[PDB]
């Protein structure tokens, strides 16, 4: 895993990372690791800006789990 | 020379086109294998063409033949 690509990914030019930005990331990755090392990786994957439309759902997941993991529901919220 | 020549013929057949390149290399390698080239000097070549042209593979095939192993190839990124 790596935030190496952040150097270009953090341009935030759309949540979906575009070709160009990704090639700059690729370049930088090859600068950091022997390209042959990298050529044994099945694929290099570039993650997108986590979209607000996603986050708007993620927080429900998190809030549910946050509460459920607090031992027993002797307190917690109704979580409305 | 004969081990090389039999392999040069396979090299010419395996590489798409680039026969002229193969022959240039073959000639120099034979000169060197014979001991006629001054032994102090390793053979060396400048592979001039298109990126994506197979120049690397030619060299790998040369390794694949002259040293009987394509994976013995040692590589240098000169742009970084």
Label each residue of B5-16 as H, E or C. HHHHHHHHHHCC
Q: Give every CB contact of residue B77 below 8 A, 6+ residues apart in sequence.
A: A30, A35
Q: Chain B contacts of A39, Cβ < 8 Å?
A: none
What is the distance between the alpha carbons of residues A74 and A67, in angstroms, rounded to a whole number? 11
Q: Cβ–Cβ of B75/A36 closer than 8 Å?
A: yes
Q: Please give the Cα distance from A15 to B21 (Å, whole number).
A: 47
Strands (E), chain B: none
The shortest C-alpha distance from A1 to chain B (Å) reads 22
Return the axis-axis angle of helices B55-66 and B2-14, rounded to nearest 10°: 150
Q: Which method was used?
A: cryo-EM
Phi and psi (nearest 5°) for A33? -120, 150
CB B15 within 8 A of CB B58: yes
Return the closest-CA partner of residue B47 out of B70, B28, B30.
B28
């Amino acid at each position: 895993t790596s935030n190496l690509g952040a150097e270009f990914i953090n341009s935030q030019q759309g949540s979906k990372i575009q070709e160009s930005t990704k090639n700059l990331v690729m370049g930088a990755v090859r600068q950091h690791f022997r390209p042959e090392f990298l050529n044994r990786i099945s694929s290099i994957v570039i993650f997108n800006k986590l979209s607000r439309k996603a986050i708007h759902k993620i927080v429900d997941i998190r809030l549910k789990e946050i509460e459920e993991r607090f031992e027993q529901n002797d307190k917690h919220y109704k979580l409305n | 020379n004969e081990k090389l020549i039999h392999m040069e013929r396979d090299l010419s057949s395996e590489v798409v086109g680039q026969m002229d390149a193969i022959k240039a290399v073959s000639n120099a390698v034979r000169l060197s294998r014979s001991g006629l080239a001054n032994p102090r000097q390793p053979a060396s070549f400048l592979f001039l063409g298109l990126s994506g042209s197979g120049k690397t593979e030619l060299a790998k095939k040369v390794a694949g033949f002259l040293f009987n192993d394509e994976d013995m190839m040692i590589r240098v990124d000169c742009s970084e």
